[PDB]
Ligand binder design. Structure first.
Ligand SMILES: *C(=O)c1cc(N)ccc1[C@@H](*)C(=O)OCCc1ccccc1
Ligand SMILES: CCCCCCCCCO[C@@H]1O[C@H](CO)[C@@H](O)[C@H](O)[C@H]1O
Ligand SMILES: [Cl-]
Length: 179
């Protein structure tokens, strides 16, 4: 069974997605988006809660599938705290990069997913004895997912910088952990 962090993130993402359909996207953003006014700067949740908002059925579905699988394996084999820190750092840095080039109106677990991909793969590669690795088939489907994003496939128009930021964090932490 999926652990407490894997579970609560999925719940939170569904609750927020529901809230977005009922109230509208823009209204949910006013509460959860990255600070878009200087007066909102000390509302600390906003540097993270942008990761809980999704705009498309397809990104929430696939973001949560990857989260469920990679997050779940990290949680079970390496503990809940590990998953928390990976999420918080990747959300913060991917958010930071995104807002820098495209402004404060954005959201999604896309960045956090890149970080779990990076983490799980590089950790399996460098430190087999940890128990976690990214299976061959999944490397392939991860790469297709990455490629679909990079080249704007399937009518998608996302920013690459934030995704790079997320992957960098996952690699960095995998590097640190395999010493
Ligand atoms: C982030 O949300 C993101 C990042 C990348 N690189 C690709 C997609 C997404 C969102 C997502 O999962 O969208 C669905 C893509 C998809 C999956 C399967 C078939 C067709 C399209
Ligand atoms: C560009 C010139 C005008 C700027 C207008 C920006 C107003 C700042 C909005 O603040 C936000 O208002 C929301 C509802 O209005 C609340 O949900 C939220 O708690 C609050 O933080
Ligand atoms: Cl989305």
């Amino acid at each position: 069974r999926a652990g407490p962090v894997t579970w609560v993130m999925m719940i939170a993402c569904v609750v927020v997605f529901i809230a977005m359909q009922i109230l509208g996207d823009q209204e949910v953003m006013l509460w959860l988006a990255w600070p878009f006014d200087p007066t909102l700067k000390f509302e600390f949740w906003r540097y993270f809660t942008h990761a809980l908002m999704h705009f498309s059925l397809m990104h929430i579905l696939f973001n949560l599938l990857w989260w469920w699988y990679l997050g779940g394996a990290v949680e079970k084999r390496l503990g809940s705290g590990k998953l928390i820190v990976i999420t918080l750092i990747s959300a913060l840095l991917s958010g930071y990069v995104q807002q820098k080039f495209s402004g404060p109106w954005f959201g999604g677990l896309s960045g956090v997913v890149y970080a779990l991909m990076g983490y799980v793969w590089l950790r399996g590669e460098r430190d087999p004895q940890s128990g976690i690795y990214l299976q061959r088939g999944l490397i392939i489907f991860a790469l297709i997912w990455i490629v679909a994003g990079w080249f704007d496939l399937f009518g998608m128009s996302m920013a690459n910088g934030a995704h790079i930021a997320g992957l960098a964090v996952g690699l960095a932490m995998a590097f640190v952990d395999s010493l």
